[PDB]
Design an enzyme around this catalytic site. Structure first.
Site, mmCIF file in Angstrom:
data_model
loop_
_atom_site.group_PDB
_atom_site.id
_atom_site.type_symbol
_atom_site.label_atom_id
_atom_site.label_comp_id
_atom_site.label_asym_id
_atom_site.label_seq_id
_atom_site.Cartn_x
_atom_site.Cartn_y
_atom_site.Cartn_z
ATOM 1 N N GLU A 11 -39.130 -84.495 -4.935
ATOM 2 C CA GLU A 11 -37.622 -84.931 -4.721
ATOM 3 C C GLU A 11 -36.859 -84.336 -5.894
ATOM 4 O O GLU A 11 -35.723 -84.046 -5.782
ATOM 5 C CB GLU A 11 -37.296 -86.192 -4.958
ATOM 6 C CG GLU A 11 -38.005 -87.275 -3.744
ATOM 7 C CD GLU A 11 -37.283 -86.908 -2.487
ATOM 8 O OE1 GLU A 11 -36.237 -86.213 -2.455
ATOM 9 O OE2 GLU A 11 -37.845 -87.230 -1.328
ATOM 10 N N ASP A 20 -28.737 -83.446 -0.034
ATOM 11 C CA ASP A 20 -30.188 -83.456 0.078
ATOM 12 C C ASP A 20 -30.544 -82.314 1.304
ATOM 13 O O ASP A 20 -29.642 -81.661 1.601
ATOM 14 C CB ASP A 20 -30.963 -84.884 0.576
ATOM 15 C CG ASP A 20 -30.361 -85.284 1.786
ATOM 16 O OD1 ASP A 20 -29.683 -84.604 2.493
ATOM 17 O OD2 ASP A 20 -30.832 -86.347 1.840
#
Ligand SMILES: CCB1C=CC=CN1
Ligand SMILES: [Cl-]
EC number: 3.2.1.17
Length: 161
Positions: A11, A20
């Protein structure tokens, strides 16, 4: 390796609001703020999550706090899902990390389409499960990360990390 180190690799860490892989406002270590395209809505979610007026920026300590909360919520969600809990409990500790990783990325109500993979995992048919897991939007949209998670499900080792 452990779930925190694994998700930190997958991440990243960013201290300002970013989009994202799906285009959604996010901060920290994969902390999704909102699916809304309005940056002001994301900023409001951030302030609510942190408890202060952040103006879109947080500290590393704050990011790690959200990460601890998000990992715990992911695991507890698995345990409170009657479809996921028996499969999770059948797995060894390394493969449990792969399961948490998948739920952290896709949401517990985003793994709904994985019924056949879940059965193969509970049966411990690891190569068959790995083949099935890759026949997915998940794999096609994030193939290098999905390949790491699938290798973890296939082998029960940390070799992909
Ligand atoms: C789809 C996430 B997952 C949940 C439990 C066991 C394996 N994978
Ligand atoms: Cl497919």
């Amino acid at each position: 390796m452990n779930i925190f180190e694994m998700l930190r690799i997958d991440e990243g860490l960013r201290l300002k609001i970013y989009k994202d892989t799906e285009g959604y406002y996010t901060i920290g270590i994969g902390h999704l703020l909102t699916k809304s395209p309005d940056l002001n809505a994301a900023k409001s979610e951030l302030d609510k999550a942190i408890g202060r007026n952040c103006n879109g920026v947080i500290t590393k300590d704050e990011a790690e706090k959200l990460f601890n909360q998000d990992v715990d919520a992911a695991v507890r969600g698995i345990l409170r899902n009657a479809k996921l809990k028996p499969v999770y409990d059948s797995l060894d500790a390394v493969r449990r990390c792969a399961a948490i990783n998948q739920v952290f990325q896709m949401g517990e109500t985003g793994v709904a389409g994985f019924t056949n993979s879940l059965r193969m995992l509970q049966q411990k048919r690891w190569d068959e499960a790995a083949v099935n897991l890759a026949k997915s939007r998940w794999y096609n949209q994030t193939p290098d990360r999905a390949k790491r998670v699938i290798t973890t499900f296939r082998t029960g080792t940390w070799d992909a990390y």
